[PDB]
Amino acid sequence: MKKRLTESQFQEAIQGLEVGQQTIEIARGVLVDGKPQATFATSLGLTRGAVSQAVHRVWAAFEDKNLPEGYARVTAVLPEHQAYIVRKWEADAKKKQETKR
Amino acid sequence: MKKRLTESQFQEAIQGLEVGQQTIEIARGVLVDGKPQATFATSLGLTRGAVSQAVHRVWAAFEDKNLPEGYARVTAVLPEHQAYIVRKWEADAKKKQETKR
């Protein structure tokens, strides 16, 4: 879980998002109140990836006006032949930041 | 030139679509009726990229089941330093599927 903040700043974040009310209402308790994401997924009956996306989308919007998550995921037009190596490169760039020896 | 979609095939696509009815209604007249997307953009006050996003959103669900696009996009975790070269690789794959000299 990340930090939480007030609805005033929450409004600033969701004003940069054209998303469904579901995403906004999750964030309203998750990163405004500071409620656990695991239980939030079970209560609403949403998927884990959907709940985590609501946290990420809204929080990153506020972060975009301050300092965002420094994680880069490159998406480009490339054939499936390139995807062979892309599978490996996904974990390999992670390994570049990781110090697991 | 693409194709139109009857309401039966439309229901097949939009059932696997997690989008607001606003985006669905775009494709309801754009794809179902096979109508120009630029006119609908001006009618709803939407951007051209937003309208075509709704076209592709519903169409991609049908594409995944039937026959997808010719342009593939790979997603890999990689830093922006690598993206310097990935930008040229993206243009190369686009030039692989488009015969230009």
| Angle (deg, nearest 10), helices A7-14 and A21-30 | 150
Domain edges within chain B: 1-101
3-state DSSP assignment of residue B76: strand
Q: Which residue type is seen at B78?
A: L
Residues of A with CB under 8 A from a CB of B: 20, 71-80, 82-83, 86, 89-91, 93-94, 96
Rounded Cα gap, residues A42 and A47, in angstroms: 8
Tokens 């903040």 sit at which residue? A5
The answer to whether A82 and B75 are in contact (CB under 8 A) is: no
Determine which of B74, B75, B81, B88 to mutate to test the interface with A (most A C-beta atoms within 10 Å): B74
Cβ within 8 Å of residue B61, ≥6 positions away: B12, B13, B14, B16, B17
Beta carbons of A77 and B71 less than 8 Å apart: yes
* Alpha-helix runs per DSSP H in A4-99: 7-14, 21-30, 37-44, 48-63, 80-97
CA B101-B94-B10 angle, to 5 degrees, is 130
Cβ within 8 Å of residue A1, ≥6 positions away: A30, A34, A36, A37, A55
Beta carbons of B75 and A72 less than 8 Å apart: no
The answer to whether B76 and A74 are in contact (CB under 8 A) is: yes
Contacts 24+ apart (CB under 8 A), A8-11: A9/A62, A10/A58, A10/A62
Rounded Cα gap, residues B101 and A12, in angstroms: 47
